[PDB]
Amino acid sequence: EVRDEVAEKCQKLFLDFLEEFIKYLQLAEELIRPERNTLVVSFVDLEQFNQQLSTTIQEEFYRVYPYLCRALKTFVKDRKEIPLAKDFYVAFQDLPTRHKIRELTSSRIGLLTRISGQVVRTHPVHPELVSGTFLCLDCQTVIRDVEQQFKYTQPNICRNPVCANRRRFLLDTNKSRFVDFQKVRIQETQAELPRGSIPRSLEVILRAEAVESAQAGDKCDFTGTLIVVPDVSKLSTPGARAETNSRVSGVDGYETEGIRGLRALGVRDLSYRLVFLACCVAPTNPTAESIKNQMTVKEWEKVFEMSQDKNLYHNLCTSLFPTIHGNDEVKRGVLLMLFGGVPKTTGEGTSLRGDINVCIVGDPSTAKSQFLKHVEE
Amino acid sequence: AGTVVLDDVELREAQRDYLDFLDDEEDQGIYQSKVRELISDNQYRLIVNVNDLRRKNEKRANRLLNNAFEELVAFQRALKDFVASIDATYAKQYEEFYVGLEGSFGSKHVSPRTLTSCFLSCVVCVEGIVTKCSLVRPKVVRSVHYCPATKKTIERRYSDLTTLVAFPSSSVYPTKDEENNPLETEYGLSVYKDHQTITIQEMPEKAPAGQLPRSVDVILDDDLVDKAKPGDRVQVVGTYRCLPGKKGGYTSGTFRTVLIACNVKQM
């Protein structure tokens, strides 16, 4: 068979990185649980460990990543007993560079990028095929391990030399391989808008554990790949297309006319669209016990310092509204509305409001919209 | 089929040429008395000298020898026209009349051993002896049926060898009415024509010594049924054509060649 040198070297060096630089052994210890599939690795550790390896992975992310997955699988298999059915994936967080959405071009297809955006919509979760198994309907041969990529792809040809079947197959879902799947829409932020331009919209795809996060309305940074997916109704006019290299001509009664000739030569239209696959999703800027535990010691010190100050009533008024003169009553009301009350329910099935609503009526130019803008900010 | 033809220069000109050929008014021709003799004798075919035609019109003779079927059709049409002209009453009896050929064909004078595919679709002359003959059999041309349930009579026309190629839609014998009422065949009103098949062999006196003989198969139509008998030395002039095999998927590519007689002469 034919092997890849770069893939082998990347496998060896990434195994060296996982074995030598150990947090990742402790995370593989957590990886035993059935709800965990992904290992999270910091990229600054890659930069420190080997600049050459980091550069190779950045310039060859798509080509190398499946082999890093196999290396991780071998590592966890050596360290612990896990059934071979389960898969495992690698993640990266701390990229030192950012790229704007419009800066994404065709030259970056397949490499590792990191962008920023705002979530607009999230679709429900579904299972998906990764590698299928098919049965030939003519000669009953079993074909296993057909890669699906990004479309429902049947086997190219029946592996029996005499059969040569390419159109009739059955799918045995029991032997197949699955992965979780979710779709999300993101939008370009306002600060990145050029003159007179509508924000750009992009589609992001989450697989397995990363599916959970990125709810609607968030403002988050993504790190992953930029990948090309085919489309159907893009070309109302003829464009680039595929064909076969065989020098085959028709015969009388079976002349290669339009439809039959196109079907005989296997002509397919080459249409494509750009899709982003995400492997790391983070907040752009980051159950009372959980909140307390999340905060560090210095943050908790600051919170406690704030807690026991009476001037908290005064200083919060001036902090949020430094420029507006007077109108301290409105500031106090807005702060009270922000903090809010406690909702309750009664035994008869009724409910009681716990929120506060505020209205401002005033003469022109009395800073009336400034409060709204400050609360929005 | 509603397809019709409006103009055809070649066929119309050939018909005009035969019309001028068989006039015999400003010439010493005899064909007028021949037609009168045919009317007197109730026969329905004519024999015309090929050399005479070549002398009067060489181009028509060349075309007729090189191409047979269309030119023969034009001859038959011209005969129908002139028989109608001289006596339209007699032309009512018969559907179409026929043409015989006579004279020295020259290069086309061909022995059963020297008949080749080069002479296909042309008129050839052959001298031989008769070896096999078959019984005379009738063939249906026009069929007539009657329905006792509805007291209606219908008629169907058949044309098999008139057209070069036949299809399954034709040659179907009707037996039931449109409402499945049985039909009764009425053999008196139908039309039949006789049919016979003979075989001709090269004469042993002419064949090269010590070599096996070669033979040709001939079909005799309604008029020439009784003109031949086995063990007889004859000369046959007629078309040389291929035989259409019945429907199939795979064909070997070998046809059967059969000579269709137009003139049979006892030398």
Partner: protein, 623 residues
């Protein structure tokens, strides 16, 4: 071959011709005005190649008219058959570059880009004779789609023995191997898209601005296809020039069939972009680059700025064919300069409007409409709306779906296309309250918020407004007060920086001067350069003296405007004073605002409203 089939082009002859021309061409007419940064006494294009070697830009721009001046055969051959001519030019340039400057590092070789083909014809005048020929376009961009990746080299992998091959696209079609190269299996080769090579594509829609217009011709929309580096070089609202080839493409009957229609489609393949124009002011693209090589012009303008009357001179030079109304022209000039664009995001206040909005209220028998027309025609990124003709959804943005593709969710309106520009509104009275509701937020927050089904977004609308209005009776009735004559809500009026109450004094000197001027009706470049330099090189700032002068002006204005009948004052007038003072500081090319600027701003504010002649306790203007 001596000639190419269907043409008369010779490859070697054209190569030698171009190589010689790159060294021989000299033009005396092109002075330092456009031969910028180049020694004129030397050949021009060789100096351009040397500058390319200095910078390393892999692209060279060539004017067609220079080539035509050198010879006509080369010009005609370049126009007629660009495909057979340009690739020769690429290698002709590359050989010279590598010979004269060996071992200079570049990522790829040089590509040549022609520009400025002389065609002043209406696009509807194009004919089939001109298919596949080089043409020029002057227009404005309104729609730009997303980038499309199009394949150039496919990658195949053997499913049986992992053998991999690459196939280069030829004639627009890819032929995948039907047999492997190491196991000889048939149809074992599969295509992998992500391993392939792709290129960028973009579709642009442009609105025509023809010089010659027949009778009764509707506006036109042109489809352009831009590839590689030309992507994202233009934005909606920009007025540009384009050089490219004219094409024709067949159209499918329906997407599911391969049949094509007989009537062809058409489009234009862009090759070159240009921003310079000899009638309108410079855009923001050129201002953000150090292209002020004309040190002579810099010195001349800096010496002019020190002269005292230059201000008035600018007010004189803004419009030669317009009458004695110098205050209006001064206000328009201060609008052109604009206030300083400070950053207040750290404060949390939000955006602060740094531009100038002006209102002109008067009878229809005046010249406000001509002023609006002149400002529209003078400044790039200008828009013009009139009365009820526009709707609330017509401005801002509206929901659409592509007639060519599946969807284009949102499309910009009049106001957004005017971003960083000027919008001129006429017949402001007839506009309904629905559109004024939009104007309320646009005129202050500089942003728009849109929330509809599946569409929540915020847009930038940093425009400057020139509004025209009429009295309710179409006459300035002196018995009614100013507020009663105007009949607009005070919230809308307060946001205008300057209000000009056009009135007819019926002075004999005015009549004589205007009659003489109107009957007699029977340096622009210097002004352009000065305006661009001032607008792009100086940030005004003010000291405590200006601060106290502004505060005194504010309290005096509040004292004067307290009386009913006249337009009352509000705190936004203080910010208007600040903006006018900063604009006046920009006029003098001064980074420091002096008390002179504040006093001039106060003078303009007082004179625009005619508060001096107006009776303070009755609200009636007198003479």
């Amino acid at each position: 071959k001596l000639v190419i089939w269907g043409t008369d082009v010779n490859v070697a002859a054209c190569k030698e011709n171009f190589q010689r021309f790159l060294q021989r061409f000299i033009d005396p007419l092109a002075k330092e005005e456009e031969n910028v940064g180049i020694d004129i006494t030397e050949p021009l294009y060789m100096q351009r190649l040397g500058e390319i070697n200095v910078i390393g830009e892999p692209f060279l721009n060539v004017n067609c008219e220079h080539i035509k001046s050198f010879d006509k055969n080369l010009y005609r051959q370049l126009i007629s058959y660009p495909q057979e001519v340009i690739p020769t030019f690429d290698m002709a340039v590359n050989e010279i570059f590598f010979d004269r400057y060996p071992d200079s590092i570049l990522e790829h070789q040089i590509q040549v880009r022609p520009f400025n083909a002389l065609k002043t014809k209406n696009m509807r005048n194009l004919n089939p004779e001109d298919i596949d020929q080089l043409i020029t376009i002057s227009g404005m961009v309104i729609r730009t789609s997303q980038l499309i990746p199009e394949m150039q080299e496919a990658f195949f992998q053997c499913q049986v023995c992992a053998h991999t091959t690459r196939v280069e696209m030829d004639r627009g079609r890819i032929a995948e191997p039907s047999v492997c190269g190491r196991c000889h299996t048939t149809h074992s080769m599969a295509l992998i898209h992500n391993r392939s090579l792709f290129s960028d594509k973009q579709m642009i829609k442009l609105q025509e601005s023809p010089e010659d217009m027949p009778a009764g011709q509707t506006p036109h929309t042109v489809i352009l296809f831009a590839h590689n580096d030309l992507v994202d070089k233009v934005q909606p609202g920009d007025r540009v020039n384009v050089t490219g080839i004219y094409r024709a493409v067949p159209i499918r009957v329906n997407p599911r069939v391969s049949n094509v229609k007989s009537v062809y489609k058409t489009h234009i393949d862009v090759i070159h972009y240009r921003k310079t124009d000899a009638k309108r002011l410079h855009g923001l693209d050129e201002e953000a680059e150090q292209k002020l090589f004309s040190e002579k012009r810099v010195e001349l303008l800096k010496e002019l700025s020190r002269k005292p009357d230059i201000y008035e001179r600018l007010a004189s030079a803004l419009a030669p064919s317009i009458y004695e109304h110098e205050d209006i022209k001064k206000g328009i000039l201060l609008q052109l300069f604009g206030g300083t664009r400070k950053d207040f995001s750290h404060t949390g206040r939000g955006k602060f409007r740094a531009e100038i909005n002006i209102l002109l209220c008067g009878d229809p028998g005046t010249s406000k409409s001509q002023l609006l027309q002149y400002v529209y025609n003078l400044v790039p990124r200008g828009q013009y709306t009139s009365g009820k003709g526009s709707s609330a959804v017509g401005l801002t943005a509206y929901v659409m779906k592509d007639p060519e593709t599946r969807q284009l969710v949102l499309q910009t309106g009049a106001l957004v296309l005017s971003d960083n520009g000027i919008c001129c509104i006429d017949e402001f009275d007839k506009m309904n309250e629905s559109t004024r509701s939009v104007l309320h937020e646009v005129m202050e927050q500089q942003t728009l918020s849109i929330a509809k089904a599946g569409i929540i977004c915020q847009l930038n609308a940093r425009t400057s407004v020139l509004a025209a209005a009429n009295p309710i009776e179409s006459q300035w009735n002196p018995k009614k007060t100013t507020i009663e004559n105007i009949q607009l809500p005070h919230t809308l009026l307060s946001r205008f920086d300057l209000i000009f109450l056009m009135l007819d004094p019926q002075d004999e000197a005015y009549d004589r001067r205007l009659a003489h001027h109107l009957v007699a009706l029977y340096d622009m470049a210097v002004l352009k350069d000065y305006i661009a330099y001032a607008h792009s090189t100086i940030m005004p700032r003010l000291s405590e003296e200006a601060s106290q002068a502004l505060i005194e002006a504010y309290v005096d204005m509040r004292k004067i405007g307290s009386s009913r009948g006249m337009v009352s004052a509000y705190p936004r007038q203080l910010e208007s004073l600040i903006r006018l003072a900063e604009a006046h500081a920009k006029v003098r090319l001064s980074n420091k605002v002096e008390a002179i600027d504040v006093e001039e701003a106060k003078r303009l504010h007082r004179e625009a409203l005619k508060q001096s002649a107006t009776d303070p306790r009755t609200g009636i203007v007198d003479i």
